[PDB]
Backbone:
């Protein structure tokens, strides 16, 4: 959960 | 205390989203989301920890979608407006929805909807064609997914093609089993992406319940509608 | 007052279109007299009429029709109740009265406006096919030839 969501935040600021 | 600030940011993100300030709304979403992670990775309780996942993943879906559309302006798009159809809402007839984006300059309509198979879906498509002829539409291009039960679809659209031909409107129907993206295109530049497509309606209450013939009074499923322009 | 002739096989004459002019936020009560609201398609004709009466803010509707002598009376009365029930859930008072003596086709709004149609609400021909245009949008449905008188006091 904290691994699935935090990675999606990286896709935004990519 | 710290999570309270995360609420204000996300609220502003929603406000900007509704005001169609998508570039600014996205950044606020990212900060609102990031603040929720610093709370999620801090909370120890298991019941509250699952509440935040729903909240975060819901916001994340919206944020990621906005980015997709802003990158999608490659000749194809321009995120102009998004109108949310809430669960069991009304006033969303095909006429009321495409009222603004329809005028005399529209002479060719493209529609990609994988779900035009069952009987009610055919009639949904039919009413969509009805309001498209009063305006100056010449040709309508439909692309739907293939059923196989497909006779009702293959013959249903065939009859609609014949009836449209009776008004001088040419209908071109093509099938493809590997489609998913819902897409509406007018040759004036406007494009519309509906979540469910032309199937965001739920079955009426009784045989003579209000909203049986006029879909403005017909309740709807929860779906999203995105508007774009091409110039 | 002005009379309008609807020619045989005419179009663009749905109740939404025909009554668009003499209807606004001022109308809060409607009266309708039509001796033929008995058959299935007629009950739907009346249904679409009510559909466009709340989009506008009407709170009371009075219906006066001739009861069917046959066995179809059962579905007629039952059907109009379901409509009255659905209207009630939207905040509309529907009143249904029967009389095998009335013959005048007359519609009345509480803003001074009132309309007399020749054939009444039943002036729409059957659809050509089961997927022909005008099936759901009665602005594309071929109408029977009739006249309509519109008065105002």
Residues:
């Amino acid at each position: 959960m904290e691994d699935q969501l935090s990675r999606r935040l990286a896709a935004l600021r990519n | 205390p710290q999570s309270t600030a995360a609420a204000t940011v996300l609220k502003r993100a929603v406000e900007l989203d509704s005001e169609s300030r998508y570039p600014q709304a996205l950044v606020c979403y990212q900060e609102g989301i990031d603040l929720l992670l610093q709370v999620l990775k801090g909370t120890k309780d298991n019941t509250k920890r699952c509440n935040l996942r729903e909240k975060i993943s819901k916001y994340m879906d919206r944020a990621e979608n906005i980015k997709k559309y802003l990158d999608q302006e490659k000749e194809d798009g321009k995120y102009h407006k998004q109108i949310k159809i809430e669960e069991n809402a009304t006033g969303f007839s095909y006429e009321s929805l495409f009222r603004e984006y329809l005028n005399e300059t529209v002479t060719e309509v493209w529609i990609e909807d994988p779900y035009i198979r069952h009987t009610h879906q055919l009639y949904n498509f039919l009413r969509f064609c009805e309001m498209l002829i009063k305006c100056k539409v010449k040709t309508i291009h439909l692309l739907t997914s293939l059923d196989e039960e497909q006779v009702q679809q293959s013959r249903g659209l065939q009859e609609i093609e014949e009836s449209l031909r009776s008004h001088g409107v040419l209908l071109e129907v093509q099938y493809s089993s590997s489609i998913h993206d819902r897409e509406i295109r007018f040759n004036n530049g406007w494009m519309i992406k509906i979540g469910r497509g032309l199937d965001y309606f739920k079955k009426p209450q009784s045989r003579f319940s209000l909203g049986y013939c006029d879909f403005d009074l017909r309740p709807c499923h929860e779906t999203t509608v995105d508007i774009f322009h091409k110039k």
In short: Chain A touches chain B through nine residues (CB under 8 Å). The helical segments of chain A are 4-12. Chain A has one helix and no strands. Residues 4 and 10 of chain A are 11 Å apart (CA to CA).
